[PDB]
Short mmCIF file of C-alpha atoms and ligand atoms in Angstrom, two decimals:
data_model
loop_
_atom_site.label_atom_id
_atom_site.label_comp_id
_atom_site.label_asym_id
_atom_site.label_seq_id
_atom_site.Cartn_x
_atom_site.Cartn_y
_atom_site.Cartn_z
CA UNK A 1 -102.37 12.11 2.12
CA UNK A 2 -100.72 10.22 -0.62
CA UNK A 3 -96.82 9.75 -0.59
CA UNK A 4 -96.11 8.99 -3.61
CA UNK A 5 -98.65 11.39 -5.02
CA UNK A 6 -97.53 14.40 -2.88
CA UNK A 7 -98.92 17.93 -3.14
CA UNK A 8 -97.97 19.52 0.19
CA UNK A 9 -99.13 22.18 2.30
CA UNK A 10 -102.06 22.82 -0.51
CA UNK A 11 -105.92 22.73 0.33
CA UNK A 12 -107.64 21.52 -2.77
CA UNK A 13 -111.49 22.48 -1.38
CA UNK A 14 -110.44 26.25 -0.73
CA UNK A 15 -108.68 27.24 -4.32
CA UNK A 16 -110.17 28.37 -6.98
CA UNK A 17 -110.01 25.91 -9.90
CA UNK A 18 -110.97 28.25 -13.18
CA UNK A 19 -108.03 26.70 -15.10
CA UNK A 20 -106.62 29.32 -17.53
CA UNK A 21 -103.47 29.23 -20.06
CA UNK A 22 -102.81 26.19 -22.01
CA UNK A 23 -105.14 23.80 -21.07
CA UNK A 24 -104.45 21.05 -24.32
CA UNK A 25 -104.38 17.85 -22.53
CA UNK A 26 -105.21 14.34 -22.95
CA UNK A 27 -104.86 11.76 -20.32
CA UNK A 28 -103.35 13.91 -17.87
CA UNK A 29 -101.68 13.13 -14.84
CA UNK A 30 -100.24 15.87 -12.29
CA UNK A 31 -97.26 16.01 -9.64
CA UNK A 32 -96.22 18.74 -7.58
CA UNK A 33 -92.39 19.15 -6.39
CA UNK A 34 -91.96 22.25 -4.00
CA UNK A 35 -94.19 25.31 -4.94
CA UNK A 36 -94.19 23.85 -8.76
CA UNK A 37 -97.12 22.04 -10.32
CA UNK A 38 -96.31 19.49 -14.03
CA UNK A 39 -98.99 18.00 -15.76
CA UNK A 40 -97.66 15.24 -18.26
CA UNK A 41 -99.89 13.84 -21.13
CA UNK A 42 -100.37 11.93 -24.27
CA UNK A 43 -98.27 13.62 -27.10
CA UNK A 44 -94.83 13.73 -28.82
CA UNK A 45 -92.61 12.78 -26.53
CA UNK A 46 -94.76 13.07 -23.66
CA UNK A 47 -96.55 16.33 -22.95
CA UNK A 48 -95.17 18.20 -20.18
CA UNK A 49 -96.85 21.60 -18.44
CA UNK A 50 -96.28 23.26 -15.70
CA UNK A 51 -97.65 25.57 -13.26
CA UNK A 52 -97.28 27.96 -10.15
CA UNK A 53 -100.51 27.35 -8.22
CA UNK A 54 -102.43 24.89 -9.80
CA UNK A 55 -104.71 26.82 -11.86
CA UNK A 56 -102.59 28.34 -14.66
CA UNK A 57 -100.89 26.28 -17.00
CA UNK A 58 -98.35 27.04 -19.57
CA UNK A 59 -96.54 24.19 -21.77
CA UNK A 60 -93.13 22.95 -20.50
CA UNK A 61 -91.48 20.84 -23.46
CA UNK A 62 -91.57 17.04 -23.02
CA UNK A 63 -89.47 14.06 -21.95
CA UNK A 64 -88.45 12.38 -25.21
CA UNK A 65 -86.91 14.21 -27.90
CA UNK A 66 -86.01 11.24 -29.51
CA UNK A 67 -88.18 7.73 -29.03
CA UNK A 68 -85.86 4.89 -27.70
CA UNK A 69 -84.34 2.60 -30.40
CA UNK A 70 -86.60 -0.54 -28.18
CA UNK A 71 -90.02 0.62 -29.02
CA UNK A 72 -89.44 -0.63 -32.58
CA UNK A 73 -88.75 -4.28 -30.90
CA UNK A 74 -92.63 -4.08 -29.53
CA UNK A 75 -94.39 -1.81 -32.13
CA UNK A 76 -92.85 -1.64 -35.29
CA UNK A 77 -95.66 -0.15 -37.26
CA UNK A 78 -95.19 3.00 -35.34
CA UNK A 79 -94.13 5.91 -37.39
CA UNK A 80 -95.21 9.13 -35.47
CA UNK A 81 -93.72 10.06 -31.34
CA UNK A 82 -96.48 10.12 -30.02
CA UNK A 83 -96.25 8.90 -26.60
CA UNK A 84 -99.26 8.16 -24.45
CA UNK A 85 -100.85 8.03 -20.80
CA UNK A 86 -98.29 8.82 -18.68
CA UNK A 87 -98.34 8.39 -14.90
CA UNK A 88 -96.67 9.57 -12.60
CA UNK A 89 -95.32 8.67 -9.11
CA UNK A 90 -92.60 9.59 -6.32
CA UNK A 91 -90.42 7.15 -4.28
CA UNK A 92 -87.62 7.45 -2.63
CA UNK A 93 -86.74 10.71 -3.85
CA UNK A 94 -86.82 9.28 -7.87
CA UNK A 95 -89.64 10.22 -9.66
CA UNK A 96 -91.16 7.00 -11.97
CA UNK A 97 -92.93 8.26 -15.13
CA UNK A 98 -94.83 5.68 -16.63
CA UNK A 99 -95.97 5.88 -20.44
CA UNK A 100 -97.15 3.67 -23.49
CA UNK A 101 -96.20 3.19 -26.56
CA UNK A 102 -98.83 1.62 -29.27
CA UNK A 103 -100.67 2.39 -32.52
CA UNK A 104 -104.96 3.43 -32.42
CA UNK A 105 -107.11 0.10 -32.43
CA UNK A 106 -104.05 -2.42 -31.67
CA UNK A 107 -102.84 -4.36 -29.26
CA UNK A 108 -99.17 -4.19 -30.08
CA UNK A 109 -98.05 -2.29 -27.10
CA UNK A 110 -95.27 -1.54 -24.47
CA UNK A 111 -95.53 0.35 -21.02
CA UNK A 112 -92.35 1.84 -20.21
CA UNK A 113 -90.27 3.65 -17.11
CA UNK A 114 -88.37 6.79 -17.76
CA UNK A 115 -87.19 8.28 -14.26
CA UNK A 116 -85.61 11.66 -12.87
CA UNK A 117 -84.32 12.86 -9.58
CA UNK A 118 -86.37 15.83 -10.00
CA UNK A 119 -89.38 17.46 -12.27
CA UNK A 120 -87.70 20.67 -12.47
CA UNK A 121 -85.76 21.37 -15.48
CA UNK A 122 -83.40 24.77 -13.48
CA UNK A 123 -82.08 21.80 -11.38
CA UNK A 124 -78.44 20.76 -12.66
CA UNK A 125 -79.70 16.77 -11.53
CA UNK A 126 -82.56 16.78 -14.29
CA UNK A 127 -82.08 14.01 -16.52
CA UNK A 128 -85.30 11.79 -17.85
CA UNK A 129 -83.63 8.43 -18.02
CA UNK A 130 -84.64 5.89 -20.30
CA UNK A 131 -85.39 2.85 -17.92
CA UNK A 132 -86.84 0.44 -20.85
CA UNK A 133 -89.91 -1.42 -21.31
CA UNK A 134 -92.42 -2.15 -18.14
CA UNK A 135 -94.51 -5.19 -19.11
CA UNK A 136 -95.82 -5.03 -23.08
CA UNK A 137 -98.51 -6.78 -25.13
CA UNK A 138 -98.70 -8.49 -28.87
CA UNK A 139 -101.56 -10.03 -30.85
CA UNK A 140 -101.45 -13.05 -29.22
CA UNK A 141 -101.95 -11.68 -25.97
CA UNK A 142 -105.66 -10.96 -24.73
CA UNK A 143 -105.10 -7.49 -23.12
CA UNK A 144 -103.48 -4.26 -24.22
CA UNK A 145 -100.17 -2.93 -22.27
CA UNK A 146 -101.57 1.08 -22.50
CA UNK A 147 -102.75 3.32 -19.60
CA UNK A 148 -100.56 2.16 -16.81
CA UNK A 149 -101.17 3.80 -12.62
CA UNK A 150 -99.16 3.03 -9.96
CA UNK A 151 -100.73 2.31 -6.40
CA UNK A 152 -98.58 1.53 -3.39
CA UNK A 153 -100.89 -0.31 -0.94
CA UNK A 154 -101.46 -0.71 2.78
CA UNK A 155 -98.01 -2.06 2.96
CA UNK A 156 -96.08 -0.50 1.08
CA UNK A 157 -95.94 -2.73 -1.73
CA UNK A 158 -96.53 -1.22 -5.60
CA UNK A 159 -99.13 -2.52 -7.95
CA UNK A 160 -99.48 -1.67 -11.81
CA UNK A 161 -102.49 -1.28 -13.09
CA UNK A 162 -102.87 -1.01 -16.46
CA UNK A 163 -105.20 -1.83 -19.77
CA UNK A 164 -107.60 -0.96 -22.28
CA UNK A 165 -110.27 -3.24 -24.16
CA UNK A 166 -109.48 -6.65 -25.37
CA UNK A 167 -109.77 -8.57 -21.62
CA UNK A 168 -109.79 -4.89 -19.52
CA UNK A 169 -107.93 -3.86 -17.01
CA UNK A 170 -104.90 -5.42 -15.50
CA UNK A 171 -102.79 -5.63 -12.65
CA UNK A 172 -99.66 -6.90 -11.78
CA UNK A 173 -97.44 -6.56 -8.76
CA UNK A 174 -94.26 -4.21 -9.26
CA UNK A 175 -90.92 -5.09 -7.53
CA UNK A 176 -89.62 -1.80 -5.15
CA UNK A 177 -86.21 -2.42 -6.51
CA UNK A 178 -86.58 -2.35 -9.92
CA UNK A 179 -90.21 -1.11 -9.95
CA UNK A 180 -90.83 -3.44 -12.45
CA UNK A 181 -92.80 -6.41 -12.10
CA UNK A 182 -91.36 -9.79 -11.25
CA UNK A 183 -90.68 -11.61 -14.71
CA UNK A 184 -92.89 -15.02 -13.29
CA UNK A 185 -95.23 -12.56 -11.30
CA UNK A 186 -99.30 -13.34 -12.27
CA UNK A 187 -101.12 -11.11 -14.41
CA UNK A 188 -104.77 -10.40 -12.74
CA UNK A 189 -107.96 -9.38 -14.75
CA UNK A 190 -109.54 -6.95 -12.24
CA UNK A 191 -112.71 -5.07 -14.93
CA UNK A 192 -114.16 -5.58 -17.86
CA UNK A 193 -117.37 -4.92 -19.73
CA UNK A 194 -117.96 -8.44 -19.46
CA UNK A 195 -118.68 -8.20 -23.63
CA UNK A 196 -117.56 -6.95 -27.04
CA UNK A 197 -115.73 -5.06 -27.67
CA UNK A 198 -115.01 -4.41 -24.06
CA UNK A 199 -114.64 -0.36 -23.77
CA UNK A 200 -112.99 -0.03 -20.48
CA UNK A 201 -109.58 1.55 -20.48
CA UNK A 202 -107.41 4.12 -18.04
CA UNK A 203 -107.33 2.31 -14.40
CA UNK A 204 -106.63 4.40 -11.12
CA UNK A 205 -106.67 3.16 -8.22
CA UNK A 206 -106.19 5.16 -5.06
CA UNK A 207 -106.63 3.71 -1.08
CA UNK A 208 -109.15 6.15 0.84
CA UNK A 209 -110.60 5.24 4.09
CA UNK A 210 -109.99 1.16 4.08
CA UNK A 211 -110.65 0.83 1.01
CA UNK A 212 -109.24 0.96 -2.87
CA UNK A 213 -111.54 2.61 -5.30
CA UNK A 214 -110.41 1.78 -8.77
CA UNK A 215 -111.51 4.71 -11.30
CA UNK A 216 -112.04 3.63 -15.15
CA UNK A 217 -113.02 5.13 -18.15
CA UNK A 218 -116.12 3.06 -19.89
CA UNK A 219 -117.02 3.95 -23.70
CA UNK A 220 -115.22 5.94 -26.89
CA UNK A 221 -112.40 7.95 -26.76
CA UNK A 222 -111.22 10.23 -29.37
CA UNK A 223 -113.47 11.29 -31.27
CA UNK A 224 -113.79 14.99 -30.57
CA UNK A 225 -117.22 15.69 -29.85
CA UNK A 226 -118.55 12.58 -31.14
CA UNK A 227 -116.69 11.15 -28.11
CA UNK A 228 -118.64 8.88 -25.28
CA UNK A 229 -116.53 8.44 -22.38
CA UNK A 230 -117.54 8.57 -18.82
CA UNK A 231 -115.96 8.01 -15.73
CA UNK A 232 -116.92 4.92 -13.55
CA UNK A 233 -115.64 3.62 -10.10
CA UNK A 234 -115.86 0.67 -8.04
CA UNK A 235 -114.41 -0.52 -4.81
CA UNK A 236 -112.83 -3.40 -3.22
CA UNK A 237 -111.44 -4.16 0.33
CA UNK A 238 -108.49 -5.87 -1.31
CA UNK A 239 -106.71 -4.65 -3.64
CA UNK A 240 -107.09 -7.76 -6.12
CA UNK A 241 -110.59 -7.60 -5.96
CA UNK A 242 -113.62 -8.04 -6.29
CA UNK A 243 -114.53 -4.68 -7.53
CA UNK A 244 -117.78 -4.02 -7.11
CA UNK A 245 -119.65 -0.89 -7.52
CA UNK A 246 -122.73 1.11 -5.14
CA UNK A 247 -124.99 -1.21 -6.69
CA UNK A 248 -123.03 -4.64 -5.97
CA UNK A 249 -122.48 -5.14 -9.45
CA UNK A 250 -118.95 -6.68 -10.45
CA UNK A 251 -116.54 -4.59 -12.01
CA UNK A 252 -116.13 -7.58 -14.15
CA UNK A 253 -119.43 -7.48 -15.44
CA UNK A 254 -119.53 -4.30 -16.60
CA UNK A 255 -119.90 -2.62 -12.93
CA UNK A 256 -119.26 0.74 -12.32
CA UNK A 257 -121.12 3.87 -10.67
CA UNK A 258 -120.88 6.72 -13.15
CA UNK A 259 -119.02 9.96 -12.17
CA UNK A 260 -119.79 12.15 -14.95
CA UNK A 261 -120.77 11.56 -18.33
CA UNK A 262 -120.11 15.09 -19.59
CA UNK A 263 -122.77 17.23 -20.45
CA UNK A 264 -123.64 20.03 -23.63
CA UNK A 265 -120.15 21.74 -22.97
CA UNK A 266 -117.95 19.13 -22.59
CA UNK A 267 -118.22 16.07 -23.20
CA UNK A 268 -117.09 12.25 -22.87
CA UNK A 269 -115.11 13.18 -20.00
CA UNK A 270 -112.55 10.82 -19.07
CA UNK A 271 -108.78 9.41 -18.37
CA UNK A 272 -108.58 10.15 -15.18
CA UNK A 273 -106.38 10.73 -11.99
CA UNK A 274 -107.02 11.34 -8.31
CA UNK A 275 -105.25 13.05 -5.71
CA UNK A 276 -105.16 14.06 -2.26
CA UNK A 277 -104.00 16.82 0.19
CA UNK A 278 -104.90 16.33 3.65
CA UNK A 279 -108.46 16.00 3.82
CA UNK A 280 -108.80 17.23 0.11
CA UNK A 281 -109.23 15.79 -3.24
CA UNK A 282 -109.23 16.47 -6.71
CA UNK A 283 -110.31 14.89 -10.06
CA UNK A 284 -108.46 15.34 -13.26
CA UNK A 285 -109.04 14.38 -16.32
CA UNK A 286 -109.66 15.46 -20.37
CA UNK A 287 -112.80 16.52 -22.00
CA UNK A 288 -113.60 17.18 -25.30
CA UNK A 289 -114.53 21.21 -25.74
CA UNK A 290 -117.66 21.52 -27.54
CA UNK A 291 -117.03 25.27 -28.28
CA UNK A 292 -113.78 24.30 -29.67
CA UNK A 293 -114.58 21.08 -32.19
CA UNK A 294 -113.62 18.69 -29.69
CA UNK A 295 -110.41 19.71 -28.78
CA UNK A 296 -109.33 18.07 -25.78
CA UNK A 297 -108.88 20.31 -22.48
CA UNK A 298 -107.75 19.38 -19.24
CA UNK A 299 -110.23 19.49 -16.29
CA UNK A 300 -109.51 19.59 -12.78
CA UNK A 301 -112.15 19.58 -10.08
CA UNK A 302 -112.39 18.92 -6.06
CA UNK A 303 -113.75 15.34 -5.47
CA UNK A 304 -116.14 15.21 -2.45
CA UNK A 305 -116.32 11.53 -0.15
CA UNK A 306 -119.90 10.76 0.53
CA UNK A 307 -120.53 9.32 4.35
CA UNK A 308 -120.56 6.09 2.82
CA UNK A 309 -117.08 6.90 0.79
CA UNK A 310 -118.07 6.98 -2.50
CA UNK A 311 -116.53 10.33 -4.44
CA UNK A 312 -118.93 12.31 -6.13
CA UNK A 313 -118.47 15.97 -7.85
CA UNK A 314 -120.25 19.33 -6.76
CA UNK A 315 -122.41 21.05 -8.37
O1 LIG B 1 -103.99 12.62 -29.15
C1 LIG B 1 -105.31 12.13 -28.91
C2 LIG B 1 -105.33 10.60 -28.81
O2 LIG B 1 -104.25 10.12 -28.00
C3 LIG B 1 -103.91 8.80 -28.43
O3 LIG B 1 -104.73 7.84 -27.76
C4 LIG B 1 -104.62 7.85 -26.32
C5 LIG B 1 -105.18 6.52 -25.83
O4 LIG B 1 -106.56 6.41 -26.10
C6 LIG B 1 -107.11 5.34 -25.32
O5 LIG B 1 -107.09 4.10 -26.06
C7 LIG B 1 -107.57 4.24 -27.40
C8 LIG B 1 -107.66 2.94 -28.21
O6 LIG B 1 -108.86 2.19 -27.95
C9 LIG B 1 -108.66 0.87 -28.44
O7 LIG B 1 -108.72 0.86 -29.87
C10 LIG B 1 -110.03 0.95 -30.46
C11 LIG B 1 -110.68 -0.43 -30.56
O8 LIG B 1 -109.78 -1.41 -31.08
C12 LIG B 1 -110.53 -2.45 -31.70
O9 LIG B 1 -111.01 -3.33 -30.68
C13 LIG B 1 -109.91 -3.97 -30.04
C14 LIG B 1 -110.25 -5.38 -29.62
O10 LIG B 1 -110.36 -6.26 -30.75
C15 LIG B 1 -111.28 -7.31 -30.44
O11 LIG B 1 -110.60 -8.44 -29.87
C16 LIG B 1 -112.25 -6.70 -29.43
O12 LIG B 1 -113.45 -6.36 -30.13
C17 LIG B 1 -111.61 -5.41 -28.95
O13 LIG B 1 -111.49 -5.35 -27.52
C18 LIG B 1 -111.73 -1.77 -32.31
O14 LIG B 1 -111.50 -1.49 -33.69
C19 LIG B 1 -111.87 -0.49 -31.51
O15 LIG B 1 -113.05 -0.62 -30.73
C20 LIG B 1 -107.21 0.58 -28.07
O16 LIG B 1 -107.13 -0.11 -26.81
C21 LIG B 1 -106.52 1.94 -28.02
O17 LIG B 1 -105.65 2.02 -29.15
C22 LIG B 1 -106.20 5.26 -24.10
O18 LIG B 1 -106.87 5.55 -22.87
C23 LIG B 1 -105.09 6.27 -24.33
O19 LIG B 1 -103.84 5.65 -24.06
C24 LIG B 1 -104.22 8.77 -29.93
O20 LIG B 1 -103.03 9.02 -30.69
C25 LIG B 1 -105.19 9.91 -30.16
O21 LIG B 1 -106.45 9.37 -30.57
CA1 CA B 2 -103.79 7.21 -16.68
#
């Protein structure tokens, strides 16, 4: 359904989604390119996997080996590679990998662009180029550059959205040139808690059916089984708003209809991604693997549309 999410010919309701291989993840994104399935997520680098049909994964390397000499302009208390959130999207045949680059509980942050003709490493073109820093964030500012999505709308045009605590969630319109944003474009507020110390974080916002449905991540992160995330979503006509969940409360009031909120086996699911093939969906995301001490594991689920269009998960 999605171009710049594309997964082809595949039916996401009729395949069987026991994941099996390695499943380490945390917040995952996926792309598909030809019969061949990545997953990139947080990690040295940036995580990559890969995959033949969805369901098995096996690690694939990752994009960085070194970090670019520029993060140290934006974050210069940094002293490990780990690189984190990635997302991923496809345009014009160049494929746009968004990622962060930040320390835990700070707001010293940059989103930045690597790109590549193609995902696939046997291809003589593949070459992650280093495409510098996106939009970033220091203590004076009120919001956190971390956790970036890109959504092309109605028109054509693409959005970042982006965020986590401080003010919430961002978003900012991108440039298709440059994919960048515009250096006098407006920075929007578009969620929040509405209150200290504001646990909203990981925006995606996908266009289904006339409307945008902006998934977010509400609680703690991180904390292996101690963790409390949960998955929320809202919904707005336009794009910028208002988002405004089933029960016509404002994202920026702490809105949001829960998805899942994990259960005994895993738990605080969250950092998620959606994704559609023809009339299918999925859900992806991490959660925290109780049987494991907390190690985070990627999920992947089909994500049902209710006759009123809100998503919801079998059972
Ligand atoms: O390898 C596993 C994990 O991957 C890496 O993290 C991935 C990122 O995790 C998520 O963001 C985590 C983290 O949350 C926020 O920090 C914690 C809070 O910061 C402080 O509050 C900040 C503000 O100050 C006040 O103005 C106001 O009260 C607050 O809004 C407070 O101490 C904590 O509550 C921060 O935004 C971010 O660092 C992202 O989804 C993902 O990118 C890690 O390496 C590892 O844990
Ligand atoms: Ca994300």
């Amino acid at each position: 359904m999605v171009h710049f999410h594309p997964f082809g010919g595949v039916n996401f309701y009729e395949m069987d989604w026991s994941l099996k291989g390695d499943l380490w993840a945390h917040d995952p994104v996926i792309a598909k390119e030809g019969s061949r399935w990545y997953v990139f997520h947080t990690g040295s680098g940036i995580q990559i996997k890969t995959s033949e049909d969805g369901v098995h994964w096996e690690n694939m390397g990752w994009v960085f080996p070194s970090l670019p000499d520029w993060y140290k302009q934006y974050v210069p208390e940094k002293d490990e590679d780990h690189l984190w959130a990635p997302d991923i999207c496809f345009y014009n045949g160049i494929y746009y990998l968004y990622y962060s680059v930040s320390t835990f509980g700070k707001n010293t942050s940059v989103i930045g662009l690597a790109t590549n003709q193609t995902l696939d490493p046997r291809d003589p073109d593949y070459e992650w180029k280093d495409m510098g820093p996106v939009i970033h964030s220091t203590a004076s500012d009120n919001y956190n550059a971390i956790d970036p999505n890109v959504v092309f709308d109605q028109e054509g045009q693409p959005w970042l959205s982006f965020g986590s605590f401080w003010s919430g969630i961002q978003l900012i319109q991108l440039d298709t040139e440059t994919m960048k944003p515009a250096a006098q474009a407006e920075l929007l507020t578009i969620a929040s808690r509405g209150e200290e110390p504001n646990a909203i974080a990981a925006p995606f916002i996908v266009c289904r059916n006339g409307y945008y449905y902006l998934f977010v991540s509400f609680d703690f992160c991180c904390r292996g089984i101690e963790s409390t995330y949960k998955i929320a979503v809202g919904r707005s006509k336009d794009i910028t708003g208002p988002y405004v969940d089933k029960n016509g409360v404002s994202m920026m009031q702490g809105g949001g209809t829960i998805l899942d909120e994990g259960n005994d086996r895993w738990i605080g699911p969250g950092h998620c991604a959606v994704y559609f093939s023809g009339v299918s969906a999925i859900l992806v995301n991490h959660a925290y693997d109780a049987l494991k001490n907390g190690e985070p594991t990627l999920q992947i689920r089909p994500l049902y549309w209710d006759d009123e269009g809100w998503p919801y998960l079998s059972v």
